[PDB]
Amino acid sequence: PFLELDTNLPANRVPAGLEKRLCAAAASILGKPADRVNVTVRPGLAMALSGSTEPCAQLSISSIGVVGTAEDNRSHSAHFFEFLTKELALGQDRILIRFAPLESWQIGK
Amino acid sequence: PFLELDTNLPANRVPAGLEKRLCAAAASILGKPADRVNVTVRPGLAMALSGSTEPCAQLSISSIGVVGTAEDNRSHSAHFFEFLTKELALGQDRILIRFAPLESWQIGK
Amino acid sequence: PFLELDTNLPANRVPAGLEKRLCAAAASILGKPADRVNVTVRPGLAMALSGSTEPCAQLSISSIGVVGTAEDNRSHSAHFFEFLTKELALGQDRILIRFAPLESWQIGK
């Protein structure tokens, strides 16, 4: 799976190594080997979340599989909220997680 | 819905509060409560649009619903072109709007 | 089609004009007119790819068509790996290409 985190927090307020710790958390939360987890963090953006420009973050989670995922995605989301509220010092109401489809992916040889 | 705007305009040429005014415009254009509208602006990127590196912007609009949306999406697109050409001082030919699917989204509690 | 390249390479290590040369390469590789090719490059991000924070890049390729694309997407991916390894001085194992769906897109008038 692929995690993409956009935030309007300034770069200096996003913890160093967030991408490493979020990768490890995702591996544990999603029950996937770390070598199948991808994380991208984009800070310093201009953002409105739920109509408000207060500090916030958007997390996209992309993957090929769709069938039967709704319930597990709710469970996973709750743990990512726990993780991100602590790391980013953001209230859970200022974090939104969305699930997006992929057709395929390939690592280079 | 979720709006994501990438542009190769330098940060200092993207208006302050664009994300707030685009959020309000989206609420009005899409006929959705502002608390369901999300906007992310990513400036200063390196971009080619329709084969050209002149100043440009890409707007992605993501949402769960797909059925019956083609005609309304054309109407909405025209108003977002109006809004963005004024705000960014870009010709409408240098703005591209694309519509992408989501499976679900959740706000934290 | 729409190419979006995220990388944790610093901005000064991403070649100037990468978006122009990647646009031309995509036109040739995909067999599409350059005026239908779009490229966005986002550098300086914090990233983990396949569980590792070593230098890396993610390329997303989005398009409306899905039917019958798996084999051609494998061919195209291999050429984009060739192109990006040279431009970015990254091993092919540090580049991941993913294919995502679009419902529609519109250029402004």
Author numbering:
A (entry chain A), B (entry chain A), C (entry chain A): 1 to 109
Task: Give verbatim excerpts from the published study on this entry.
pmcThe human macrophage migration inhibitory factor (MIF) superfamily, comprised of MIF and D-dopachrome tautomerase (DDT, also called MIF-2), is broadly and constitutively expressed with involvement in proinflammatory and host antimicrobial responses. MIF and MIF-2 are highly similar in structure, with monomeric units of 114 and 117 amino acids, respectively, that form homotrimers. An evolutionarily conserved proline at the N terminus acts as the catalytic base for a tautomerization reaction of unknown biological significance in both proteins. The same site in MIF-2 is Phe100 and is also evolutionarily conserved among all MIF-2 proteins, suggesting this site plays an important role in both proteins.
In agreement with MIF enzyme kinetics, the activity was decreased in the S62A and F100A variants by 13% and 60% (versus wt-MIF-2), respectively. The substantial change in F100A enzymatic activity despite ∼9 Å between the mutation and catalytic sites implies long-range communication within the MIF-2 structure. Surprisingly, the F100A variant has a higher RMSD (1.245 Å) with wt-MIF-2, displaying substantial conformational changes in the β-strand housing the F100A mutation, the C-terminal region, and the loop 63 to 69 connecting the third β-strand to the second α-helix. These changes were not observed in the Y99A MIF mutant, but in MIF-2, this mutation induces the adjacent Pro101 from each subunit to form a “lid” over the solvent cavity to separate external and internal water molecules. There are significant differences in the F100A variant including a conformational change in the active site residue Ile64 and increased dynamics of the active site Arg36 and C-terminal Met114 side chains (dynamics are interpreted from the absence of electron density). In addition, the expansion in the F100A variant is also only 0.9 Å due to the loss of the large side chain near the mouth of the cavity and movement of Pro101 into this space, a conformational change not observed in Tyr99 MIF variants. There is an even slightly smaller network of water molecules trapped between Pro101 and Arg42 in F100A MIF-2, which has a kcat/Km ∼40% of wt-MIF-2. It must be noted that changes in the F100A water network are partly due to the truncation of the solvent cavity from multiple conformational changes. However, F100A displays more line broadening, particularly in residues 60 to 65 that were noted to undergo a conformational change in the F100A crystal structure. The P1G and F100A variants show similar levels of dynamic perturbation; however, the effects of F100A are strongest at the C terminus, most notably residues Ile107 and Ile110, which have been purported to be involved in CD74 activation. Before our X-ray structure of F100A MIF-2 showed significant conformational changes, it was unclear why a Phe100 mutation would have a larger effect on the activity in MIF-2.
